[PDB]
Amino acid sequence: VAESWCYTQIKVVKFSYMWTINNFSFCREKMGEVIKS
Amino acid sequence: SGPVAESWCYTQIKVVKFSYMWTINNFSFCREKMGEVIKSSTFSSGANDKLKWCLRVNPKGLDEESKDYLSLYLLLVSCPKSEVRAKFKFSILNAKGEETKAMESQRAYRFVQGKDWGFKKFIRRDFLLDEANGLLPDDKLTLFCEVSVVQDSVNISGQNTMNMVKVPECRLADELGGLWENSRFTDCCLCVAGQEFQAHKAILAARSPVFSAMFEHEMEESKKNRVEINDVEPEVFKEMMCFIYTGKAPNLDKMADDLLAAADKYALERLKVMCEDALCSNLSVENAAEILILADLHSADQLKTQAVDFINYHASDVLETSGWKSMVVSHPHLVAEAYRSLASAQCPFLGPP
């Protein structure tokens, strides 16, 4: 049995990102309040 | 997963790290009382010279605080006005070149013009003057210092698009190098030590001036097939030919000496540099004189420089070697350059002994 379908697919957007710091042990320097990316 | 992150960022707060060594004669004979100033050379990192550092040590610590202690201060000579923030540490190096007393600054100490940080109460005077430790050979204190200057913020961003297609890597080096092994469509011979190889004028003249010169001087018109080569053996000439076509030298380390000679013969700049680099890694005490001879014969400036440095460093063990005396009797000019070099770097005008 079937009379009316309404899929109304919820819009999903997805995407990636990465963050590499090569000197994490010594990446502080400025006392590490915040790193402006 | 490693999905490339779509957008990607590679921020890099680079840190330049270098070292500075100081050794003072008769340290127990200094006796700087109550902040008397003794200074050291203004030294930079080495990669250019924009800012300079200099140490300042008081064998008897200044002020009533370090009355029974050694006060040691690191001073900024000059720098750009940016509130410089660089980390530093100090340690005492023993006679055997082993780090002994690690005292690291807890953070990147801030420096400006005319300002000097330091590890006050560096070392207690009773322990410092104690000769039983062995840290004072000939009453000389060797200090090892490291610095970690930072430029404070440089960032990179993006992109790595999808690239739905998959482009293979360029194959000209791989494909063209396959010309040698097949020896396809060759039209000239190449005699080496009674053994005949096959090549052609185009690539050889392309990647070496010498072959270009000897072929074009009426030789390729009449005697193009036959060329007389006897200064080298077929085994090394195989690799050097492979370098001419392909531009690579896989079997280089096994015969790095006569292959350097072959490169010098035909003026192969890249292969000369590669042979110098490969052979400089195998420098040793016994072959120092021999390596000096080969470098001098082929005008290997870089390898000659490193060999000069090596003999200056290890003359204590090289003179007794037979190679050194053979070089002396045969080619005394290298003895003259060795005398000039060693009389300036390590054993010069009595300082250091």
Q: What is the CATH number of the domain that holds B190?
A: 3.30.710.10
- B141 has which bridge partners? B24
Three-state DSSP class for residue B201: helix
Contact B264, B272 (CB under 8 A): yes
Asked if A20 has any chain B CB less than 8 Å from its own CB, the reply is yes
The sign of the dihedral angle between the CA atoms of B269, B201, B238, B257 is: negative
Burial B141-170 (b: 16+ CB within 10 A, else e): bbbbbebbbbebeeeeeeeeeeeeeeeeee
Evaluate whether A16 touches B3 at the Cβ level (below 8 Å).
yes
Cα B275 from Cα B267, distance rounded (Å): 13
- Between CA B213 and CA B204 the distance in angstroms is 10
Phi, psi dihedral angles at B308 (to 5 degrees): -60, -45
Distance CA B50, CA B53 (A): 11
The whole-angstrom separation of Cα B263 and Cα B341 is 28
CB contact under 8 A, A20 and B10: yes
> Position A3: which residue type?
E
Q: Are B59 and B100 in contact, with CB atoms under 8 Å apart? A: no
Q: Give yes or no: residues B111 and B22 share one domain.
A: yes
- B201, B224 contact by CB (below 8 A): yes
CATH number for position B137: 2.60.210.10
SS3 A4: coil
Whether residue B24 is found in the same domain as residue B142 = yes
* Rounded Cα–Cα distance for residues B300 and B67 (Å): 57
Q: Do B143 and B99 fall into the same domain?
A: yes
Q: Are strands B228-229 and B188-192 parallel, antiparallel or unpaired?
A: parallel
Structure tokens at B263: 């490169």
Contacts of A14 in chain B (CB under 8 A): none
For residue A29, which residues of chain B lie inside 8 Å, CB to CB? 13, 15, 85, 87, 108, 150, 152
Record the resolution, in angstroms: 3.7
Place of tokens 């997805």: A14
A29 touching chain B per CB within 8 A = yes
- Cis status, amide bond into B137, omega within 30 of 0: no
- The residue of B6, B10, B13 whose CB has the most chain A CBs within 10 angstroms, and thus the best one to mutate to test that interface, is B13
To the nearest 5 percent, what fractions of chain A are helix, strand and coil? 10, 5, 90
Closest-CA residue of A relative to B3 is A16
Q: CA-to-CA distance for B42 and B51, rounded, in angstroms?
A: 9
CA dihedral B251→B255→B261→B267, nearest 10 degrees, is 10
Q: How many Cβ atoms sit within 10 Å of the Cβ of residue B74?
A: 25
* CA atoms of B129 and B43, how far apart (whole Å): 28
- Tell whether B31 and B144 lie within a shared domain: yes
Residues B113 and B224 in one domain: no
On whether the CB atoms of residues B176 and B245 are closer than 8 A, the answer is: yes
Q: Are residues B30 and B79 in the same domain?
A: yes
Give the Cα separation of B210 and B229 in Å (integer).
13
Name which of B25, B84, B91, B29 is nearest B53 in CA terms.
B84
Do residues B186 and B140 both lie within one domain?
no
Q: Note whether B221 and B273 are same-domain residues.
A: yes
The Cα–Cα gap between B227 and B266 comes to 14
Of B10, B150, B155, which has the smallest distance from its Cβ to A29's Cβ? Answer: B150
Cα angle vertex B19, ends B12, B156, to 5°?
Answer: 10
Is residue B175 domain-shared with residue B264, that is, in the same domain? yes
- What residue of A is the nearest CA neighbor of B9? A19
CB pairs under 8 A between A and B: 48
Same domain for B116 and B45? yes
Instruction: State whether residue B337 sits within 8 Å of chain A by CB.
Output: no
Measured between beta carbons, the chain A residues lying within 8 angstroms of B12 are 21-22
Structure-token pair, residue A27: 């990446």
Q: Are B211 and B178 within one domain?
A: yes
Q: Does B2 touch chain A (CB under 8 A)?
A: no
Query: Does B146 lie at the interface with A, CB-CB under 8 angstroms?
Result: no
**B302: preceding bond cis by omega (within 30 degrees):** no
Q: Is A18's Cβ below 8 Å from some Cβ in B?
A: yes
Identify all chain A residues contacting B8, using CB atoms and an 8 Å cutoff.
Answer: 17-18
Cβ neighbours, 10 Å, residue B271: 25
B209 and B101 both lie in a single domain: no
Q: Which domain holds residue B122?
A: 18-149
Taking only Cα atoms into account, the Rg of chain A, rounded to an integer number of angstroms, comes to: 23
Q: Give the dihedral of Cα atoms B312, B317, B322, B323; nearest 10 deg.
A: -30
